[PDB]
Design a protein around this ligand. Structure first.
Ligand SMILES: [Cl-]
Ligand SMILES: [Zn+2]
Ligand SMILES: [Zn+2]
Ligand SMILES: [Zn+2]
Ligand SMILES: [Zn+2]
Ligand SMILES: [Zn+2]
Lengths: 396, 98, 197, 396, 396
């Protein structure tokens, strides 16, 4: 991995720094590293495999070194370097794709493709130089059992889930009490509905709880909390739990009462926010507990009092909401996020070569299935393929 | 090698370097250098008992045919040319025996 | 190569100039890094050109004589030797304008040696330039070029050749040639040359 | 014009032939010509004018020569050549544009821009080399008082004109005899119509004649003659000569009779084609005379006999048409055609830079007005600008 | 591509110039280029692939150099040259055919066949010499992101479409107002029809608009405009839009009124032509807007007044036509045109060898489908195959 990354980084530096007219002293160390890579790779035969529709490709390395002959680089030097760099970049991209399309149940973090297994030999270790990118840095630290994290903007931590719970229900679905929620990506939009508007509640208070267990621990998370859930504030015709029939939802939005967001780690109260909205910070957590109350307004204007009668039928259903958005976080494990392209890159490579479903990942690299059952083996394989994808992104 | 040269000096030296008259020399070139009718004459046995390294070179003679057509309208020069050729041929004709 | 670089090689010479402009107006001496003050012409624009080679070959000095007598500005063009004069007093004496009457006298141009002034601090009388208010001028300019500066980037090259080889001249020395016994020598028809035996 | 063309051709050959890896022997003469051009242009200042919105541009030439001592051209050589080629091409394009937007009445064939007048001096005659293009070849031949011709595919020799002549008419336009025609570009469609179908004509024959006088002589012209004019073969409502009213045309197409197409030069018949359709050759002519006849069919089936009564009203009007298409021809003078872009280039350059209307060409370089009044001054200016446009086309 | 073109150009020059009795001075540079090509190709093994029914061919190059020691070429020299020329021409033709039948979505501009990929190696760049063809010129320009240009006579820019739009309609289809057009090749015929002849229209004017969007920008285009559209000037029975029924069209042609042809670039009017027909220039445009009015003639003769009653039934329908023909134009992208054979060559090669349909081009290289959805990938692949076709047409 470090050798493959070092090849990619050397090639990127060569493409960016070996430019016409540049001082010889701008590239001396780069030329030395590039010649070291050429020497190490010369005389070695590589094969990128024929898994799926990925074509089998054979790579031979017999390239002359780069000289150091002009004070300012000229077009001839750049052209020779470009020829060598193009061949090497093609080889590295093919190696990255081959590694990306494989997986293993037992040693998911270890190399899978023959080319990357060969590049893990001692003879190629000389190619290894600066490992500065976030993913390679995390890879190297993780190999040493050191604490490190990936920073995600809008981490895709919640598997898609749009469902409801009815705590009070009837066959006619006309006096319902329960909760709706959408947990999608970095967003949790929850709502608690009472059709009776807590007319018969002990203190005209109906308590609602939503507990979301994160599949991985998130640290240093910045979170936006908003009182209302816009997704559950318009009339809906909703299938029953079995799908036998459909019931009617006609929300009227009330201010959430006694709102408490608890971010829990190991069952301990790490962070607590009571009636606080806007931007909040969750230090380090793996569970979110949103508890909110629907309180019947003690004093109502005649129209509001007309909305909520003392008994059935109930045509306007009182709803309290909550929206939680993880704008950024840090996770010890790799995750899909809104800014990076690693999941997109791996999925595109797997789809474009018709890679058969393996024993580790879900079909089509479906992210909801992947995060739903985010096992340690899947974590290892995903980290491997994401690191390879980030290596490939430096050139392709 | 690095060199310091005036652009005109570089032009001259680069022309000399880029347009050298030496060609690679191998046993096939030497064999074809022999006249084709002597290579086919069974009275002569020709062998190549020398090894030429890949670093062997030679300069091709310029055997272009007469551009001046001295056989046409140069009576005195052609007389001289044929006289010289006649003397050389006399030198190379064998002597009768027995 | 020689033809395209001829003019550059010629203008690099320090003992011939490319011409002389006789302009009977006073022209300021140019300020050149190689001379100081110098009556140097960068080009011949604005002057009638008389080719000195053609004048020498024809022998017709009527036009040049008429122009020199009537003080008609002209440019005499041709490889000319020149005198380098570092004296400010010579410039004040206007000796550069006194060198063209021999053309009319002798009807020759092979002795024309225009004056090129080189006035700088090394001149014995440079104080006249420094301690007085005046513009050093002359009525004649010498059509000559300035040397090209050495540039390391423009002169550093890589010369490429072969490490080593051996050149051979006698190819037929590499052929081991034997002949059959003359008794057995055959002709083109594969029969013996002489069959009477 | 020859020097401008030589600059353009040298630059085009430099672009085409100075390519990486090519043997110097492939470009030796081209490099000699290029260096000759550089030497001749060095030390000269040029100004391309401010006519219209074309900006005033100043051009200086202090370029070094190209190398002549490589066996094969490399990247450095090509880059060094390209640096000079770009500037020279820009200068040539600007000179061509400046010359294209100018015109003179007294001497329209002579250069109009100051740059091209400067390039006509003796000191630039050294730049001149191979003059092989059709337009420059014609220019040089014509400067030599030599017979030369431009070959046109579909020459645009006919000014646009859709018109009719009524040889018999009345205020109600119900018994009309006459001719309709469109002369457009390289095409003539003519049709003689009789509303009575020659019921009261001598021998039941009506004669129609159409003369088209070409503004320039055409030679070795290939022409398609077809026996019908589809442009005048369907019902039409047509304005009157003064536009006071509109009349009705309801053609029924009959075979034209005694079709004679004469191609005449100085009033003398050069070529005559009687009842010939398909490809014909007009070797040298300046006038086309189409004579045809509407012959009343002596025998008519009842459906036919119904259409042509003995007297009015005439609801079906008997029409006989001819179509004459000039596929290819040769002209002494320059002409717009379907294949060449000279007119389009000149018009585009004049439109882009908002060139005011001059004393020679009509506004907008309109081709109908131009070819209608093809005066000698117009011909001179038009050949000059067309040659300059062809020169510009080699590089732009 | 430049090396393949250089091979083809060298072979064509050898065929043309190496003739018996010619001075060696006429071929010295050509002979040097030919011998350089022989040296470069000698010892290399090529394979033209077996895609489709194209046979697999193996190519070996062991050829002797052409002599340089003659004053005039003789029969021996010509025969020795011609054997090698025949072999090389066959090889080049097979390489071109292999490349023409191939395509890719990702890098369609890059070589697809193994042979052309091999020829793109540096060790063949020595073969490269004069790139003077229009297609290779544009290929080299486009490889550098320079302004390209292809000149087309009658460019095939309009995908075929014979359609109509009814702005006034009803089940009887006896009082219809709308437009019918044929946009085919370089031609647009459009015709606006009103069955009522604008009896009830405001000011007795019916306005018709036809907007044609070109899939590429055309520059320096010369266009013929003609008042009438002959294709919609005869009675027709036209299927309905759904194809459920057929309606009847019985045009009577009136001249169009207030004709406005606008040539627009990005929605900005670049060129405007009002009431002008003969020949016009559109310097830079990608959209054509044809506005034309049917004006009921205020004064009518009794027959014309009979044609157009005050109300239904309407038996004669007033139609105003317009024909727009692009005779020649310039486009930065390759196009099929009436003069070249690139599309024909590519389609013929793909048809003759039963090449399966690929991801990029529509089946059968159908030009209407290709130009309708002229995507950037399609443009790259089409330019590649068209350049290869032009290279092949130099020898075949
Ligand atoms: Cl965002
Ligand atoms: Zn964002
Ligand atoms: Zn339910
Ligand atoms: Zn009338
Ligand atoms: Zn045509
Ligand atoms: Zn319909």
């Amino acid at each position: 991995m470090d050798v493959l990354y070092s090849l990619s980084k050397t090639l990127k530096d060569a493409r960016d720094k070996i430019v016409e007219g540049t001082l010889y002293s701008n590239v001396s160390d780069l030329i030395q590293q590039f010649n070291q890579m050429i020497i190490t790779m010369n005389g070695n035969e590589f094969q990128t495999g024929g898994i799926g529709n990925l074509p089998i490709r054979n790579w031979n390395f017999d390239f002359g070194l780069l000289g150091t002959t002009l004070l300012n680089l000229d077009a001839n030097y750049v052209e020779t370097a470009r020829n060598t760099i193009d061949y090497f970049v093609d080889f590295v991209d093919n190696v990255c794709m081959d590694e990306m399309v494989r997986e293993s149940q037992r040693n998911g973090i270890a190399p899978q493709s023959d080319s990357l297994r060969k590049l893990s030999g001692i003879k190629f270790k000389r190619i290894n130089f600066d490992n500065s990118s976030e993913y390679i840095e995390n890879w190297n630290l993780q190999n040493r059992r050191q604490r490190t994290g990936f920073t995600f903007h809008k981490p895709n931590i919640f598997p898609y889930s749009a469902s409801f719970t009815l705590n009070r229900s009837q066959p006619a679905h006309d006096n319902l009490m329960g909760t709706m929620w959408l947990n999608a990506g970095s967003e949790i939009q929850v709502a608690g509905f009472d059709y009776s508007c807590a007319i018969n509640a002990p203190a005209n208070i109906q308590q609602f709880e939503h507990i979301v267990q994160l599949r991985r621990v998130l640290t240093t998370a910045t979170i936006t909390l908003l009182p209302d859930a816009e997704r559950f504030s318009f009339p809906r015709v909703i299938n029953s739990a079995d799908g036998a029939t459909t019931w009617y939802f006609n929300p009227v939005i009330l201010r959430p009462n006694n709102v408490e967001v608890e971010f829990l780690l190991n069952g301990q109260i790490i962070n607590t926010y009571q009636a606080r909205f806007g931007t909040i910070i969750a230090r380090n957590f793996d569970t979110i507990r949103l508890s909110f109350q629907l309180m019947r307004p003690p004093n109502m204007t005649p129209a509001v009092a007309a909305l909520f009668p003392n008994a059935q039928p109930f045509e306007h259903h009182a709803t309290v909401g909550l929206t939680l958005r993880i704008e950024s976080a840090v996770c010890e494990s790799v995750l899909a996020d809104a800014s990076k392209t690693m999941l997109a890159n791996v999925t595109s490579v797997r789809q474009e070569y018709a890679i058969p479903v393996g024993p580790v990942f879900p079909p089509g690299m479906n992210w909801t299935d992947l995060i739903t059952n985010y096992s340690p083996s899947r974590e290892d394989n995903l980290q491997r393929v994401f690191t390879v994808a980030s290596i490939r992104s430096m050139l392709v | 090698y690095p060199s310091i040269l005036h652009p005109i000096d570089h032009a001259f030296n680069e022309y000399f370097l880029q347009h050298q008259l030496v060609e690679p020399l191998n046993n096939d070139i030497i064999f074809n250098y022999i006249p084709e009718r002597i290579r086919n004459d069974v009275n002569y046995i020709l062998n190549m008992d020398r090894n030429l390294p890949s670093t062997a070179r030679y300069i091709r003679p310029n055997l272009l045919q007469d551009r001046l057509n001295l056989h046409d309208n140069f009576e005195s020069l052609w007389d001289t040319i044929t006289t010289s050729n006649y003397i050389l041929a006399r030198s190379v004709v064998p002597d009768l025996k027995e | 190569l020689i033809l395209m670089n001829m003019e550059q090689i010629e203008r690099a010479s320090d003992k011939i100039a490319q011409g002389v402009i006789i302009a009977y107006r006073d022209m300021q001496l140019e300020r050149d890094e190689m001379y100081g003050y110098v009556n140097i012409a960068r080009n011949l624009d604005g002057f009638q050109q008389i080719n000195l080679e053609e004048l020498m070959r024809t022998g017709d000095y009527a036009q040049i004589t008429n122009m020199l007598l009537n003080n008609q500005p002209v440019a005499l063009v041709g490889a000319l030797p020149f005198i380098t004069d570092s004296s400010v007093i010579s410039l004040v004496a206007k000796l550069d304008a006194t060198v063209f009457a021999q053309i009319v006298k002798l009807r020759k141009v092979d002795t024309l040696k225009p004056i090129l002034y080189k006035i700088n601090s090394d001149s014995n009388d440079f104080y006249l330039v420094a301690n007085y208010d005046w513009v050093p001028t002359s009525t004649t300019k010498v059509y000559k070029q300035i040397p090209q500066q050495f540039d390391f980037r423009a002169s550093m090259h890589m010369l490429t050749s072969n490490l080593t080889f051996t050149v051979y001249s006698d190819l037929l020395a590499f052929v081991s040639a034997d002949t059959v016994e003359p008794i057995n020598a055959v002709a083109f028809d594969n029969m013996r040359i002489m069959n009477e035996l």
